[PDB]
Structure 1
Amino acid sequence: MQLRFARLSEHATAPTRGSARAAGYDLYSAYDYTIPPMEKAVVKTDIQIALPSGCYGRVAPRSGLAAKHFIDVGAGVIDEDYRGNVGVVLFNFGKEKFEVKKGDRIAQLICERIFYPEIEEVQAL
């Protein structure tokens, strides 16, 4: 099934995936942020998504931002039934401030397949 989304404001950008077999859709900041050194920011995308059945959506790092600028992505687990505004929690572990501009790609969204098991307690395994 498809990944669907809707744009919660005009500042949102539709996620894109250039390559057919790329693991994730690019997520774009809907706003300017300045993240000082050793600080975190929630970067809003102003999109809502409806994930396909049988996965969650992992908000995962973009490789170049980590290797060049020491940016990481925190949190990241979007439940299959989440319909709120997707926020990317960015961590700037670098020594200088990191600027996000509206329309910058700042993370990717991977549809990771998972089980939804029932849980059972036993005395010992």
Structure 2
Amino acid sequence: HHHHHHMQLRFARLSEHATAPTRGSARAAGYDLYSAYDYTIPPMEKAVVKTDIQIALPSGCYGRVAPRSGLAAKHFIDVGAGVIDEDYRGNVGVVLFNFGKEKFEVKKGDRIAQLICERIFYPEIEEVQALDDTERGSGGFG
């Protein structure tokens, strides 16, 4: 209209322990997220890792916390939960799963996940009596 600009990923540090999120290349899908504390995760266990950052996502997306590739392939690390709502203003947490047979050590400053700005719709929901058939139909689960 009057103003012509690009939306930014806004963040604020909640402590001196946080690291500003980084992007490897100009077209990496995600911003790197860093642990603010030390964690020791035993075999077949989980931990909630605090980043000590609050974020304000641009309109029309949510923030998906996604796994690092190397951590999954080499160490059997996975990311649980992962849905950061557009209107969340709290401390960003990463839920890490250790499926390996050895303990996994997280140190303050380690890169442990990535944040992706996934574009979504926010549709209104409408109940109907019945839906119409497609070629796929009710065919599911292999």
* Unaligned segments of structure 2, at least 5 residues: 1-6, 132-142
Question: What do the CA deviations read for 1:40-92 (whole angstroms, capped 9, x no partner)?
Answer: 00000000000001100000000000000000000000000000000000000
Q: What root-mean-square deviation, in Å, do the aligned CA atoms of Structure 1 and Structure 2 show? A: 0.3
Q: For residues 44 and 71 of structure 1, what CA distance do their matches in structure 2 show?
A: 17
Q: For residues 24 and 76 of structure 2, what CA distance do their matches in structure 1 show?
A: 24
Aligned to 2:76: 70
Q: For residues 24 and 12 of structure 2, what CA distance do their matches in structure 1 show?
A: 20
Q: Runs of 4 or more off by more than 2 Å in structure 1?
A: none
| Greater fraction of residues in strand | 1
Aligned to 1:121: 127
Match for 2:31 among 25, 30, 43?
Answer: 25
Deviation at 1:18, TM superposition (A): 1.8
Q: Secondary structure at the match of 1:96?
A: coil
Deviation at 1:112, TM superposition (A): 0.2
Q: For residues 62 and 99 of structure 1, what CA distance do their matches in structure 2 show?
A: 15
TM-score, normalized by length of structure 2?
A: 0.88
Q: For residues 19 and 9 of structure 1, what CA distance do their matches in structure 2 show?
A: 27
Deviation at 1:109, TM superposition (A): 0.2
Q: Secondary structure at the match of 1:53?
A: coil
Q: For residues 64 and 6 of structure 1, what CA distance do their matches in structure 2 show?
A: 28
Deviation at 1:116, TM superposition (A): 0.2
Deviation at 1:95, TM superposition (A): 0.2
Deviation at 1:8, TM superposition (A): 0.1
Q: Secondary structure at the match of 2:46?
A: strand
**Structure with the larger RCO, 1 or 2 (CA within 8 Å, 6+ apart):** 1
